Assembly symmetry: D2
Homo-oligomer: 265 residues x 4
């Protein structure tokens, strides 16, 4: 009783929605955040008000860089994130790799390039690798009698992977590595009954820092409804794949994109 | 309003689990069968004992062959028409009925072509077209709010079962139907998706399944079909969901 | 001198495939349905360059019976492959290129379209591959050729359906399934089976959307790829589809 | 006057066959290497004996680490590889991202961080900085003086959907390399730079194991029941670089004898 979910980047948008949907199914939730301390503490208050000691927050930079209090490597920051679930609640049944940087890295016209690469690949790919390693190590270190009955890892990927967004090469590479992680971890962790799946949004909760015609033009291209998704239209799929009814699904990436990946220029 | 689901090959195995699953969600279900009349009728009796007027059975050969002439198109149209005649609506279509047997490359090949392609591909196309036409012909204020078509595909499509070429071709066509009808029917808010089992309710290779080293139960597949029809899945369309316990991840 | 059977060979990509294969030394069997004049003019051209290097054979590849007991699509397909063995004693390459292509809208006569689009694009390739494979298996091992290749012309844009073309889109997906299934099952006979998928090629606006060059392709930009896949240098390639689309499948709306 | 190709990891096996195959078509080849200096210099001597001034060798660690000086970054090392082509021959027309470390990183059980940097560097990040450096030098060339057939080939993996057990970082990096292939092909199409992939299945399998075990692996390939020769892969790379392939971009060609069609 009281399964525990770890959701990275849980403070806002899709990750907040995922944490809420998991909390609504009875999970205690560990809300990871990087820079959004206010929103993460506000969400924690809301969920703890519904159920005392059902949400906590942990801060971590998931870029592939070392930090300071010897320097602290990304891998041990990820190990410590999983550790916060077992320390507080004695378990971790669900891990959602949701946190993600996303900005252009154009090929056509150096501290920027160096920090872009660690940031985008760490957050979207390498920290997921380390977190899965930490999550799976902990299941392995748990006596079988004490293991949970429904371990589930979700990687937030991208429905539009075969149709790249112009000028976003590092991001697209990182989401491709994340799909590779989904398949590889699914295979390798199957004997522990840890399922690993991907959920791929198309356009979801689209930021509108552009002229109104440009924003409406973007959304209008989604065949189903001619709009971007809501946060829940994505997070409800995450919550299903973690549910026990999804127990035979692993290594699978589910598009939640309104048909947008079906389109062509 | 009680929504209606048409499930083909509903009498046994996955199709029965899909009919039972939608019925537990509150659907009235049209149970299509070909030869399993006794089984279909017994399933209908069970579901109607639970909720009166919640199940009917209809029979039809979904092979691509003229019947006694009645064409496959006409038989598929009448199947959708059965739902509208009995309940005035059809909200969900599950294209589950499917013949499966070898057509090795190295009149019985023409019977196999019409049977394997009809059930797995050509009948689903007519059924989808009939479902779409009835929705379009319905005044927009009287339309339902959660239209959903599920095609039962094959998670192992990229890894062909040796000797099953026509079956594999037909399931590849059904994936093409999924994508094309999802695109074209999006303006009517009809979602079109696939669910692809791996090894399920085998009647060996099951020890090779990475997750649990067994074929799936019926519910482990039908529970997914039910979710994709749920309104929580209403932004998913044009997508095929593998339910294979990772079997498609394997190699020889 | 090896032999290629090319369906729908009279014009456009099929004619360029036949020309490309012929230029590598192949004798070519030029299949046609309605374009008898174009097929026979092409045959005249290739035979003038190399005597007895081309023939032509007519067949409706729709999944329908034709009159002389009615003749089924299966039989007409068997007779296309037999035409190569009768005339030249071999058939080393089969290019499944013939294809009907027109709308079959789901929204806003259909038995004919089903038989025609699914026949040419999927069921006839299935029957032709079976006939082609039977003839190789029936050939004594010492007398088989050393480079059997089957090429199915598919569609680069298959994951991105063209609005209103459901039957065509379904048929090309069946054809990709046939490519994978036939490649696995015919591998012991060393018969390779691959696909080539154009995007927009030799169109009769949308051109500007192609990332590479902002144009549809020429016929040779496709047929050269077919020709390489049939070459001995490509002998380890089977069961795979090669996109030749200028990057169009990378685009989104 | 003579087109120039930069082949990473050119000293042995597939990279050497790719170098030989492009050289046979008339390319001058820059042969990159990391540890195999003897093998690289032997190959360059062979190519130069066949055709004077048709090969050079360059060393670089393509791991995502800083190297010995102010430290030298991976990007800098990557730009200097491409610049070596322009310094010596004035041009760089083809890039083959072939260099690749390959060993397990099991999920269950400094050498952790160096393996990530090495597997992710060789297979994904160094490809990226090499593609950018290559693209930058083309963009900087006046259109009057640009080459007419720019081609980038990424060596991917036909078995990407069917992961090798215990090889998670490798599998991830190749998945990233496929993303690079698609993204670079779209962004560099305006400069007529094509970007494609070639994915071997089992090629030139090392036989440092029991014979029965090596024959057992090989026998799983449906076509010929063997791993491929080096030329059976490199000939495809050379075709994709040819002008006959000039409408192909953004595409990954499996050269796997049907292995990806198999299941357990
Ligand atoms: N929304 C969409 O349209 C699409 C989304 N996706 C994927 O879905 C997931 C969520 O989408 P969305 O909710 O829009 O994602 P956001 O862009 O809102 O970012 C989510 C969180 O990622 C965290 N984050 C970013 N960089 C780092 C870092 N270097 N270290 C640690 N945390 C970091 C931030 O946490 P903080 O605020 O605490 O700094 C941010 O709140 C992502 O994986 C995204 O890639 C994929 C395709 C489309
Ligand atoms: N079970 C598995 O492991 C897998 C299943 N699938 C797919 O999932 C779906 C169901 O799986 P399963 O339950 O095993 O399927 P079955 O093989 O049990 O067949 C299901 C039903 O199809 C109907 N059917 C067959 N041919 C025709 C026809 N010509 N006309 C009309 N109805 C016909 C039969 O109805 P009747 O009995 O009334 O004649 C049969 O009961 C199918 O689409 C199948 O391809 C895909 C991959 C794996
Ligand atoms: N061109 C493009 O942009 C694209 C092409 N493709 C594929 O490339 C291949 C060739 O393309 P293209 O050259 O444009 O094809 P065409 O549309 O020109 O059709 C080629 C030939 O197919 C034959 N054909 C049509 N219906 C039948 C039938 N029922 N029975 C027998 N033969 C028939 C016709 O032969 P006749 O004239 O003798 O009647 C026609 O000349 C096709 O398979 C096509 O699907 C795929 C994607 C894009
Ligand atoms: N062979 C196969 O069966 C398959 C191969 N592939 C891909 O094809 C390509 C070639 O295959 P193969 O020839 O087997 O590859 P190899 O394993 O023989 O490695 C080729 C070269 O990579 C170079 N390399 C490795 N790590 C680094 C590094 N950190 N920095 C710089 N150079 C490095 C080495 O150069 P040096 O020796 O000079 O140090 C090595 O000779 C690779 O990309 C591989 O992933 C994909 C699937 C199957
Ligand atoms: N981490 C993450 N966060 C996101 O918000 C996100 N969004 C998408 C959805 N795709 C897009 C595409 C374009 C723009 C956008 O705002 N474009 C601006 C500037 C950048 C551009 O050139 O596209 C525009 O004006 O077009 C946003 C989201 C995909 N992955 C993500 N990943
Ligand atoms: N329509 C359909 N029915 C199924 O039962 C089915 N099963 C699978 C799962 N794959 C397989 C693969 C091999 C065998 C098999 O070995 N069959 C036995 C007899 C059972 C049979 O063929 O139905 C055999 O003797 O070959 C069964 C299922 C995939 N698609 C299906 N499709
Ligand atoms: N068998 C086959 N033949 C083809 O020509 C073909 N072409 C494509 C390329 N895609 C397309 C998409 C749209 C139109 C189209 O709508 N044609 C216009 C042309 C009218 C004009 O000349 O302006 C039309 O409406 O007829 C053609 C090709 C794909 N598969 C094919 N398959
Ligand atoms: N860079 C690279 N080099 C390769 O040789 C290579 N080979 C493959 C072909 N796949 C495989 C699969 C398994 C084994 C294997 O069994 N190796 C042993 C150790 C032997 C060794 O790699 O030196 C193993 O323990 O996995 C080798 C190659 C795929 N990618 C590659 N990538």
């Amino acid at each position: 009783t009281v399964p525990v979910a770890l959701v990275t980047g849980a403070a806002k948008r899709l990750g907040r929605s995922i944490a809420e949907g998991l909390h609504a199914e009875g999970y205690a939730v560990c809300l990871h955040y990087h820079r959004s301390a206010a929103e993460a503490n506000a969400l924690s208050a809301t969920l703890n008000a519904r159920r005392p000691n059902s949400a906590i927050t942990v801060q971590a930079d998931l870029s592939n860089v070392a930090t300071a209090p010897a320097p602290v490597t990304l891998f041990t920051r990820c190990a410590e994130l999983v550790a916060a679930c077992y320390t507080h609640w004695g378990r971790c049944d669900v891990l959602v790799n949701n946190a993600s940087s996303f900005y252009p890295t154009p090929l056509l016209r150096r501290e920027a390039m160096e920090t872009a690469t660690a940031d985008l690949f760490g957050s979207n790919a390498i920290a997921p690798y380390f977190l899965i390693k930490a999550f799976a190590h902990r299941v392995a270190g748990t006596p079988a009698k004490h293991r949970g009955t429904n371990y589930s890892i979700i990687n937030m990927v991208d429905a539009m992977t075969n149709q790249p967004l112009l000028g976003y090469t590092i991001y697209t590479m990182a989401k491709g590595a994340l799909e590779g992680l989904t398949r590889s971890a699914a295979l390798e962790l199957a004997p522990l009954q840890i399922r690993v799946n991907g959920v791929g949004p198309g356009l979801s909760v689209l930021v509108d820092d552009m002229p109104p015609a440009v924003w409406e033009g973007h959304r209008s291209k989604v065949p189903l409804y001619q709009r971007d998704s809501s946060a829940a239209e994505v997070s409800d799929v995450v919550i299903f794949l973690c549910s026990s009814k999804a127990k035979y699904i692993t290594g699978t990436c589910v598009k939640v994109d309104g048909g947008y990946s079906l389109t062509r220029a």
